[PDB]
Amino acid sequence: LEVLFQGPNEFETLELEHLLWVNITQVKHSIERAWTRELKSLNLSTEKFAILHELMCLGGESTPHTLARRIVFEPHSVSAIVSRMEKDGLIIKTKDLKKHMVRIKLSEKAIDTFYQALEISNRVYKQMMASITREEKVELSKTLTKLRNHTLPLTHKHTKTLTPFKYI
Amino acid sequence: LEVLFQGPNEFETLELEHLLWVNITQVKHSIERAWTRELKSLNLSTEKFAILHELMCLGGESTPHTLARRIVFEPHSVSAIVSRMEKDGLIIKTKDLKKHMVRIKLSEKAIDTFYQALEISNRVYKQMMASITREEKVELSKTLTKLRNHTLPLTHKHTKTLTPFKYI
Ligand SMILES: Oc1ccc(Cl)c(Cl)c1
Ligand SMILES: Oc1ccc(Cl)c(Cl)c1
Residues of B with CB below 8 A from A71's CB? Predict the structure, then answer.
């Protein structure tokens, strides 16, 4: 009845640490694809929202090097996102009055967009994660934080001082 | 002594579900940046390795639509990666003898590269995740699997039948 010689091969059984990498990548892709569609009317990708958010934690005004230190992304990535946001009218760049240093500031459009995006974003993430309990969320953050603290220094050696986000 | 009016503002305190999104994104970026440097001698990015791996689970030979169904990535992404791998000599594309259907096959170079990459990749992930216990790994996979199962159908409605990876 069942056909022979069809069933899965050895490459479908993974070490648990490799399966964890597949699980992390699948959840990041799934939760971001659903969030990006709900934020479409504000024309915000996940990385434009993360840079908006970091600049709101910095009081709406910083420099490229301080913004890069606070976020996980690579500096060339941070710069490309900031350029796209400058073209969208979300960031104003001005020369520091320090030769070659740039200051980056959110426009009041960007701050009002962040107004709107944070409220939608909070509902989206709450509905997405309603199938895990408060306890499972707290433990997931703790485990992921352990992994981030072990692994970020393997390639970022004093170059990041990531924003110390809290929850209650 | 401590300066006044400097400490963090309200945007540094998040809802736990938003902090979980930041934690997922930070761990994915940290573990991938360290893995990509160790795999550099094989010229494999994370997505070229994931497509190599999926095609090894499919017996080294499939079609673009079957490969896309098995992996989380978007089809245009899968196609762009497959094109880059065709240029690297990792994938051979041949016309099905079905007008307009393409078959994609790994070259024996690609299979030998996967030989080497899986062994390095397993050590890299084992060393990276040595700071969490077996129990914390098992629970992390379970929680992430719950989140993936809740959230993938919000935007992928019968378009994926993801490879059912196991661990022991
Ligand atoms: O709101 C944020 C802030 C930083 C990051 Cl890395 C992310 Cl994913 C979302
Ligand atoms: O080895 C793999 C297979 C699929 C995915 Cl999505 C990943 Cl991240 C790694």
Answer: none
Note down the domain range covering A150. 1-168
Q: What is the resolution of this structure in A?
A: 1.5
Beta pairing partners, A13 = B166
Cβ neighbours of residue B38 under 8 Å, at least 6 residues apart? B120, B124
d(CA A91, CA A81): 10
Q: Is B72 in the pocket of ligand 2 (CB under 6 A)?
A: yes
Q: Does residue B50 have its Cβ closer than 6 Å to ligand 2?
A: yes
Across the beta sheet with A61-62, the strand order is A61-62, A102-106, A91-95
How many domains is chain A built from?
1
Interstrand relation of A91-95 and B91-95 (parallel, antiparallel or unpaired): unpaired
Residue A100 sits in a domain of what CATH number?
1.10.10.10
Question: Which residue type, as a one-letter code, is found at position B15?
Answer: E
CA atoms within 13 Å, Cβ hemisphere of B15: 16
- Residue pair A31/A46 in contact (Cβ under 8 Å)? The answer is no
